Amino acid sequence: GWVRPDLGELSKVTKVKTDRPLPENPYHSRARPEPNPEAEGDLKPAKHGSRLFFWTM
Amino acid sequence: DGPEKNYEKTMAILQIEAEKAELRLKELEVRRLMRARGDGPWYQYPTIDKALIDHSPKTTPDN
C-alpha cells in the first residue's frame, strides 16, 4: 500500500520534531572585541578658531 | 589713551595665545596616541562590512 510521491513533493522543505538541544555556538567562535566608544554630544564652535599659525579665524 | 587700555589688551592677548599654545600641544599628543592605538574616531581605516555575509544553508553542512 505504498503511494509513489508526485512531482514537486520530495523537494519540499519540511519541519522536524526532535529532542536534540539546539547548539548554542556551533562555530566555536571567541568573544567579539569591544566596539569603539562612539562618543556623542552637541557641537560647539572651535576654540579660538583654526589655531593655524597666525590665523585668528 | 591711558595705560590701562594697553595693559588689559595685552593681558587678554596673552591669555588667548597661551590657551592656543596649550591646545596645540594637546592636539599633537591626542593625534599621536590616536594613531598609535586606533581607539578613537580619527584614523579609523575601513574594514570589511559584515552585512555582506550570507547566512543560509550552503548545500554542504560544513559551510
Instruction: Name the nearest CA neighbour of B42 among B55, B27, B53, B23.
Output: B27
d(CA A13, CA A6): 15
Resolution (A): 3.3
Distance in angstroms (rounded) separating the CA atoms of residues B54 and A41: 36
Of A37, A38, A51, the CB nearest to B24: A51
Looking at residue A54, the DSSP 8-state letter turns out to be: T
Q: CB atoms < 10 A from the CB of B11, how many?
A: 10
Which method was used? cryo-EM
Q: Does B24 touch chain A (CB under 8 A)?
A: yes
Which triple of cell numbers denotes residue B57?
544553508
With 0-12 / 13-18 / 19 or more C-beta atoms within 10 angstroms meaning exposed / middle / buried, residue B41 is exposed
